[PDB]
Amino acid sequence: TRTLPPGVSDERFDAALQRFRDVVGDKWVLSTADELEAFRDPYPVGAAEANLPSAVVSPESTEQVQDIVRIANEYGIPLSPVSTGKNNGYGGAAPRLSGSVIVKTGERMNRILEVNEKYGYALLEPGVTYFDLYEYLQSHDSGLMLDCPDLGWGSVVGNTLDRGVGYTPYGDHFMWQTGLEVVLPQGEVMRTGMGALPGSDAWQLFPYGFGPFPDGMFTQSNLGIVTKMGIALMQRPPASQSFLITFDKEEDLEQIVDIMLPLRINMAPLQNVPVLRNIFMDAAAVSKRTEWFDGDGPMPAEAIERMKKDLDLGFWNFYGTLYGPPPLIEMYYGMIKEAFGKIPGARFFTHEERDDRGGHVLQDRHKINNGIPSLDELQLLDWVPNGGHIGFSPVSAPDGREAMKQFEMVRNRANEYNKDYAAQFIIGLREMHHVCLFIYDTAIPEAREEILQMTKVLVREAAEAGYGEYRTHNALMDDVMATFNWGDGALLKFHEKIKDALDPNGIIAPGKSGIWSQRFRGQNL
Amino acid sequence: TRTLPPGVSDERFDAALQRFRDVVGDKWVLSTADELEAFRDPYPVGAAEANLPSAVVSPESTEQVQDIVRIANEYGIPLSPVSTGKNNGYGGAAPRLSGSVIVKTGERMNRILEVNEKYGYALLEPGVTYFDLYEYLQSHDSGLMLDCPDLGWGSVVGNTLDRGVGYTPYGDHFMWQTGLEVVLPQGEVMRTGMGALPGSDAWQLFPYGFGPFPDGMFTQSNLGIVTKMGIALMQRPPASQSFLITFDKEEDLEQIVDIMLPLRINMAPLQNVPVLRNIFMDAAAVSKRTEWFDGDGPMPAEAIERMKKDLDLGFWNFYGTLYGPPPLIEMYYGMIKEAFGKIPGARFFTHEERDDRGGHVLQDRHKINNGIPSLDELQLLDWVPNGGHIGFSPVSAPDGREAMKQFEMVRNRANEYNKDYAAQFIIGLREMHHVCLFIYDTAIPEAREEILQMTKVLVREAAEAGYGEYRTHNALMDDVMATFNWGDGALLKFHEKIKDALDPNGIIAPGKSGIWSQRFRGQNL
Ligand SMILES: *Cc1cc2c(cc1C)nc1c(=O)[nH]c(=O)nc-1n2C[C@H](O)[C@H](O)[C@H](O)COP(=O)(O)OP(=O)(O)OC[C@H]1O[C@@H](n2cnc3c(N)ncnc32)[C@H](O)[C@@H]1O
Ligand SMILES: *Cc1cc2c(cc1C)nc1c(=O)[nH]c(=O)nc-1n2C[C@H](O)[C@H](O)[C@H](O)COP(=O)(O)OP(=O)(O)OC[C@H]1O[C@@H](n2cnc3c(N)ncnc32)[C@H](O)[C@@H]1O
Ligand SMILES: C/C=C/c1ccc(O)c(OC)c1
Ligand SMILES: C/C=C/c1ccc(O)c(OC)c1
């Protein structure tokens, strides 16, 4: 049947659609079943249908966004804002609440408003992709570099709004976000920071402004539709060098992490955001599962050994980058070798030293860690047919015992539900994002349901061990928010109060981060 | 006459006081005229009496803070939270709204809850001063260092909650804040970030947690009473060196700033937060005004030259610190000399090369910039009798011309109101906090009034030129918030909406940052 917003009739939904067309143009509102297929989660989770959009609206400007918001308030139509809608692993462009209208800001609001070479910043609309900004920087012979996630087709803005991550020293996107413009849930427009001071030139210079600092409240949030965002850009260093350290054993995880911490916490000699990837992650990037194993169930030990040998990789593979004058690089690299060289079986390779298939990941990281966006990691989804992934993404202390515990816990369930567990620890100064990608066949109802049930188990079991997720998929948002229930669910109650105050009609992305406005609470969708 | 909360009778106040004594104990509620004299602003602004507390309550736990808040809500009594109450220049411990009860959290909530050597952080109650944490670190032979403002008697927490600043690489306090516990305006308690996850070890490891990120909303804010805060701590480097560069001309300001920017924006060779201080600031630190000029008006140029010559300082004096192995320090100092040595008249001194009176500020910065707290700068307040100061603190782009225009704009009004303009530019990566301290005799009603009128003029003039303040005094909060009125006052309306939703009875620090809850709006308070 036609997907309709909750509580809204065919007839009223038709009238609302026409008003959206009055604002944006007929070509810029999609509402047929065929046209909406493209906006389904590409990596669906759960057997049953879920996260169904009712329409897609593509506004050209902040004023059109305002008008759309006003219409949605009058009709009681929920709006789900995206930038580019490439949140794959977490839902793609699909709304948490079925029946919502997707507001695809990035389709037409895709301008680079300013790149300031002197002060090292950009001012962006939501449709500027990493590729788009890279092209700009290259075209203008900029001395600045961007910080990108693994896939360059996402949005500088949109990735930041979900507190996404990259891998240069500017890898904490939200840290470097400076100023934003947002349309609030009843249609009012607001600028944060120094941008609230008319005529200031400091909107991208000083993030805080005056008074309570609100920008974080627009991240992983349903408090508005963001229309402009600033971000600091790092100066490109004079030289760089990337390296891979292979570690032979699953059980080396503990020592790897413990040796890493003292080298990272001061931002030297580990200057970039290191990643520690398991052999499933690296093999999926360069090969299909049937190259190593075509039986049933989890891949046997002997098959794991063949991936390692054929690709010349370890069970754990550490990738980092160094920057600066050549002698600084050499000094740092020497320190890294000496430290991690304690682990029996450790082998080191720079980006100049390996040109082979297994080395493809190191070459990709050398691009990414130098702000050169890439789509090479899309190959991961060829690991099994109709491949998809979901991101289960607990936070870990930068402690080997903790990391090992988390690894063992996830691996036990992955094996039990027959899903391959590819791991990427993303290593900050004092924490790691432990990204667990389960790669699966999206066509098969039981695969999708095992994914859902396995990840619900892992959310709960992680939380019982004191671990929480940094980011999650539409299907897990209620379960993850339910783990952050210190003080009798104080955090969620606080969010809901602000939600209801700013969005009295319950319009913007209901259910994002488990935050449902009053009219939807307790309805279980 | 007895100071009472607004619309609260003598008897209703006496009843409240009793309820507060029941919670905290008799000794820990102050309510006599002369016990309250000590909580008046030490540097009063304006001729007329303002910012009068009705009582001070000193809780020993979060549970007590919750009960005090519940009592206040029942009675309609405003509560103005402070940590140590040393926000001198901006109000001291005094409340914005006369008749509020000061909640002096730090008197008895003064425990160092954790200092973690491995992960480099502290979890703190509000009463922990910089001197307290320093003593802890020294006693335990820690490898960590703290980051302090110029006066060590403040609160690690309280300073961060007003987005205050220090001078090491960790000098953006709010940037390094990681987790907090807050009592919300009806008495609910909440932990942010990973602290919301029961049993997490990552409260001080990963700041954002899950969902909308709220910690900024409790800074320069009246949304709660903070009871615990975490902060990252830097590893002490193996060596450090501080330096002074003196510049001879008032007109050198533009070139100093333009040369500085490329050396600062990448955190090297200017690793620390540089300060650029004028001769008035440095002379006040070491000498009284009457040493150089006796006369009620602006200091003549010949007296300025005498200050410079006797103290062997410039009109502009640049202070920085370098850290790391001794060869790194040498490369960076050499670069700094080569760049700033292009300004005619520039002279360079390390912390080993001055033992004279004018060198005293260098020695003090060498402490501060190494996380060694000091109160030597209290000498500034001896510039004139009964000395006080107010901070007029605009943000500047790191542009020489902008810094010069601000300098000239402020200097001109200072002349007109007969106040000396002491300047300290605090230089971030992409912005400067341009702190203007006006030092005056707090005992002369007319001087307190000129300070008020002058600074009201400066706020308006600066906003007409596109400059806003990062932080301000109780007397200026409304005027400063009024400058940030892009989009017909959008930012303030947003803040009011949240305030009213969290604080329906209008209890917590009414008027902080210009944010008044519903029962107080449109009033002359
Ligand atoms: C499958 C996968 C995913 C992945 C990755 C590797 C693989 C194989 N590596 C990643 C990495 O290195 N770092 C990282 O942060 N994420 C990584 N991913 C996940 C995903 O690809 C990316 O994060 C991607 O950049 C996110 O998608 P996009 O950038 O297109 O962002 P979006 O879908 O438009 O928005 C995400 C959410 O943010 C909120 N949002 C977005 N725009 C707005 C506006 N304008 N206003 C309000 N809120 C907005 C929404 O919640 C939206 O859903
Ligand atoms: C006169 C002066 C001041 C000064 C300075 C040099 C001189 C000569 N140099 C400074 C510097 O280098 N950096 C800096 O940040 N400030 C400097 N100042 C100003 C002042 O001395 C310090 O900032 C000082 O540390 C601040 O005072 P304190 O640390 O005691 O903090 P507070 O008065 O307790 O709190 C300030 C405000 O924060 C909010 N607050 C505080 N505690 C709470 C709790 N628990 N809950 C909610 N809000 C709280 C209040 O708004 C409070 O007024
Ligand atoms: C190789 C995968 C990287 C990744 C990093 C961070 C994420 O949140 C993520 O989500 C699917 C994926
Ligand atoms: C020497 C003055 C330092 C200072 C720095 C930052 C401030 O906000 C400030 O305010 C009174 C003072």
Author numbering:
A (entry chain A), B (entry chain B): 2 to 526
Pull text from the paper:
The structural bases of substrate and inhibitor binding by the cavity were explored by solving the crystal structures of EUGO in complexes with isoeugenol (inhibitor), coniferyl alcohol (2, reaction product and inhibitor), and vanillin (4, reaction product); these were obtained by crystal soaking, resulting in highly defined electron density maps. All these ligands bind with their aromatic moiety stacking against the pyrimidine ring of the flavin and the Cα atom of the aliphatic substituent lying right above the flavin N5 atom at a distance of 3.2 Å. In this orientation, the ligand 4‐hydroxy group is H‐bonded to Tyr91 and Tyr471 and is also in close contact with Arg472 (3.5 Å). However, comparative analysis of the three‐dimensional structures also revealed striking differences between EUGO and VAO. Above all, inhibitor/product binding differs in a 180° flipped orientation. This can be visualized by superimposing the isoeugenol complexes of the two enzymes. The ligand methoxy groups are in opposed orientations and occupy different niches in the active sites of the two enzymes. In EUGO, the methoxy moiety is in close contact with Gly392, which replaces the Phe424 residue of VAO. This bulkier aromatic side chain of VAO likely creates steric hindrance, impeding the binding orientation found in EUGO. Conversely, the flipped isoeugenol bound to VAO positions the methoxy group in direct contact with a valine residue that is conserved in EUGO (Val166).
